[PDB]
Structure 1
Amino acid sequence: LPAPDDTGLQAVLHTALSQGAPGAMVRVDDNGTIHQLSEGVADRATGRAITTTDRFRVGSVTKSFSAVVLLQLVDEGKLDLDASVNTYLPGLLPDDRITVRQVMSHRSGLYDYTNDMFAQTVPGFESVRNKVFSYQDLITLSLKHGVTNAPGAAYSYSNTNFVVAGMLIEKLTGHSVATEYQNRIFTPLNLTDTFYVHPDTVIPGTHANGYLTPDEAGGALVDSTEQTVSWAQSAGAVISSTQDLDTFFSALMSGQLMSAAQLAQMQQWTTVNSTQGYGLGLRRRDLSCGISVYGHTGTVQGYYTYAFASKDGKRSVTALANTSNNVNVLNTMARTLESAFCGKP
């Protein structure tokens, strides 16, 4: 690979601050050589500076943790990817023909209930932040809508799919998703900054605060740090750090977290757009220099995450800006992948 470009990374963070992120940071593990940069503040009211050791909410990167657990269950013979969801969760879905593989690749047609919840950004956050949902509650919200496509027929990202994932994990194992994440992933990889505390609202230890951008341009930022994330759970509630997401996606891509056969299934790509694919709880992004990288993005209120690794896991990058509902920041932070993998032009 090209050398990572730290000057480029510094400019990405500086641009993200100019666009409204209180703080922005990035860590690269380049085959045992670390790159780490941060600019701005973890807490904009106290002025405490952001650092790459600050814990944060990873949002939908959680789906890759859920998918690893599920694929280990496939390895153990407890789950068949082409079986019906309803084989395992009787009566859950009205169409007993929707399969686990379709759910995990966002081809199931299940409507994304969060499109109800967050039509208005700050009101929607205020609605859900202190609510506790069951898994079934969220499925019922989705099923108020008809499916958006026939089973398998179309890619349509939906949080509901990884609510199903968490239900599958809990049913098949008899354990909570927190226990399964801990025993199958966090403990074996020594992810000392990684937690699943749902429905607790506290982020353990030193953390970046999250700042939700209101829909009104120029409006005052909302501290969105402390919330249950119960509207997402196994689709979105993990807490981690740049180092630990780097460790995780390197371990995934280098073949440490499941059989070779199941990693292959995880990397069967459904087209998302002309430069992106989706596997089983995993994204592929194609970079300008002809490199593809593998991992996941997250958007949860106040936090935008990118966490991606090269195909063999030897280079991994995690970037965080502590705002959300700010498309300019989201698009800027993607540039960390170009600077970290493609290097200086």
Structure 2
Amino acid sequence: ADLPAPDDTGLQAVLHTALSQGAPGAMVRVDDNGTIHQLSEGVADRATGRAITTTDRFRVGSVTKSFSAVVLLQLVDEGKLDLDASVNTYLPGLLPDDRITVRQVMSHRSGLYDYTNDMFAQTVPGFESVRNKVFSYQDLITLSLKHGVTNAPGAAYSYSNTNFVVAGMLIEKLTGHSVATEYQNRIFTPLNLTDTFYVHPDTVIPGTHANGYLTPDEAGGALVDSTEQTVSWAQSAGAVISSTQDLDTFFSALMSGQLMSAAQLAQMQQWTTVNSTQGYGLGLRRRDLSCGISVYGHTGTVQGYYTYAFASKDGKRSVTALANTSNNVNVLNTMARTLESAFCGKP
């Protein structure tokens, strides 16, 4: 049915709170079926003092998985990929088990160890070690394969970045084009997303952007500017750059059925249980809100940025919130509240 009115004061309180908890800046945009809501507080660059705004560009991290999933599902629509075929069928000798399918990799049921557990054990030293490095898809898979699988094929949900590194490799193999070209042609261009880029391995964010600040592991540590990095450790799992308006457009288009066939969208929303209030389909998350409504989209965490991009079942209302800091669980939990205010409204 019709959603309650978004609560702008509640949203203001959420942003203000994230600022009191360590986030230099924070903002949220709500596209409510043609009526826009925009709020922001804090700075985009804590050194120069520039204010953050809802037009600022940022790194979306893991939200990138929805972009990748959309490309793969279109490939299914075209007859080039079968979700239930072995990953080894399309990429011979890649994985140690032929029973792991494309569907399992897309929904995090493959058992592949997540190599970031090795890279970022120590947050700051980990970021300094990989920020300027360029990795191939093979490099990452091989890092994952040094460890055994964590469960039998399809047996259980376990989030792993590796799954979407494999996703990127699949896209390039089946199409013969880089993933950048694929995103541009199938998603960016058609949707006219002018603030959305996949520039890997470039370290600059084009145009006006919010800088990201990595919180150190030690309490009271000085913030580290993490804005410029290759994001080569994530690639098809988390290197997309976008804006609130573009992510709002992308998720509203996805949910209203404009990015693929109805048959594939239903496949994408085939939920594996994550916990009591969350689900994961094919590169898509479901969050159950307190007022009894569910939102669809994805979260993203990459050094210096926390992103929440969700939309209603029909795509009529979409929301993108962003705080420019990471490795701060208080800011992470607080920002999730923009969802309650935006979709559930005034308590």
What's the TM-score bracket when you normalise by the shorter of the two chains? Answer: over 0.9
Counterpart CA distance in 1 for 2:170 and 2:34 is 36
Per-residue CA deviation, residues 16-66 of structure 1 (Å, 9 max, x unaligned), is: 000000000000000000000000000000000000000000000000000
In 2, Cα distance between equivalents of 1:34 and 1:291: 21
TM-fit CA distance, 1:178: 0.3
Shift of 1:310: 0.1
1:129-162 Cα offsets, whole Å, 9 max, x none, are 0000000000000000000000000000000000
Q: Whole-Å Cα distance in 1 between the matches of residues 188 and 25 of structure 2?
A: 26
Structure 1 position 292, deviation (Å): 0.1
The residue number in structure 2 matching 1:86 is 88
- For residues 33 and 88 of structure 1, the distance between their equivalents in structure 2, rounded to whole angstroms, comes to 45
Q: 1:225-254, CA deviations, whole angstroms, 9 ceiling, x for partnerless residues?
A: 000000000000000000000000000000
- Aligned mates of 1:18, 1:233 — CA distance in 2: 32
CA distance in 2, matches of 1:303, 1:238: 12
Q: State the shift of 1:72 in Å.
A: 0.1
Q: Which whole-Å CA distance do the structure 2 matches of 1:78 and 1:337 have between them?
A: 37
Aligned length: 345
CA distance in 1, matches of 2:147, 2:34: 48
In structure 1, which of residues 240, 259, 268 is the aligned counterpart of residue 242 of structure 2?
Answer: 240
3-state SS of the aligned residue for 1:184? helix
SS of the aligned residue for 2:322 comes to strand
Query: Distance between the aligned counterparts of 1:149 and 1:324, measured in 2?
Result: 29
Task: Give me the whole-angstrom Cα distance separating, in 2, the residues matched to 1:339 and 1:243.
Answer: 18
Shift of 1:121: 0.3
Superposed displacement of residue 199, structure 1: 0.2
Structure 2 counterpart of 1:63: 65
Give deviations 1:55-82, integer Å, cap 9, x for gaps.
Answer: 0000000000000000000000000000
Aligned residue number for residue 4 of structure 1: 6
Q: Separation in 1 of the partners of 2:19 and 2:206?
A: 25
Alignment of 1:49-198 (within 5 A): 49-198=51-200
SS across alignment from 1:293: strand
What secondary structure does 2:336 align onto?
A: helix
Q: CA deviation at 1:171?
A: 0.3
Partner of 1:292: 294
Rounded Cα–Cα distance in structure 2 between residues aligned with 1:16 and 1:85: 41
Of all paired residues, the percent bearing the same amino acid is 100
Q: CA deviation at 1:187?
A: 0.1
| Residue 264 of structure 1, CA deviation | 0.3
Cα distance between partner residues in 2 of 1:198 and 1:219: 30
Segments of 4+ in structure 1 off by > 3 A? none
Deviations 1:169-203 (Å, cap 9, x if unpaired)? 00000000000000000000000000000000000
Distance (whole Å) between structure 1 residues aligned to residue 313 and residue 91 of structure 2: 34
Aligned to 1:188, the other structure's residue is in SS state helix
Deviation at residue 288 of structure 1 after TM alignment: 0.2
Q: Deviations over 1:303-333 (max 9, x none)?
A: 0000000000000000000000000000000
Using the alignment, how far apart are the partners of 1:278 and 1:105 within structure 2?
6
The secondary structure found in structure 2 opposite 1:289 is coil
Q: Structure 2: how far apart are the matches of 1:218 and 1:14?
A: 20
Q: Give the secondary-structure state (helix, strand or coil) at the position aligned to 1:306.
A: strand
Q: Report deviation, 1:213.
A: 0.1
TM-score, L = length of structure 1: 1.00
Give the secondary-structure state (helix, strand or coil) at the position aligned to 2:27.
Answer: strand
| Structure 2: stretches of 5+ with no match in the other structure | none
The whole-number CA distance in structure 1 between the counterparts of 2:239 and 2:305 is 12
Return the offset for 1:295.
0.2
Q: Deviations over 1:83-109 (max 9, x none)?
A: 000100111001011000000000000
Find the aligned partners of 2:211 and 2:338 in 1 and give their Cα distance.
Answer: 21
Structure 2: distance between partners of 1:156 and 1:336: 26
Distance in 1 separating the partners of 2:49 and 2:219:
23
Q: Unmatched 5+ residue regions in structure 1? A: none
Aligned-residue Cα RMSD (Å) equals 0.2
Shift of 1:255: 0.1
Distance 1:54 1:166 in 2: 27
CA distance in 1, matches of 2:43, 2:130: 26
Measured in 2, the distance between the counterparts of 1:96 and 1:124 equals 32
Cα distance in 2 between the residues matched to 1:146 and 1:280 = 23
Deviation at 1:291, TM superposition (A): 0.5
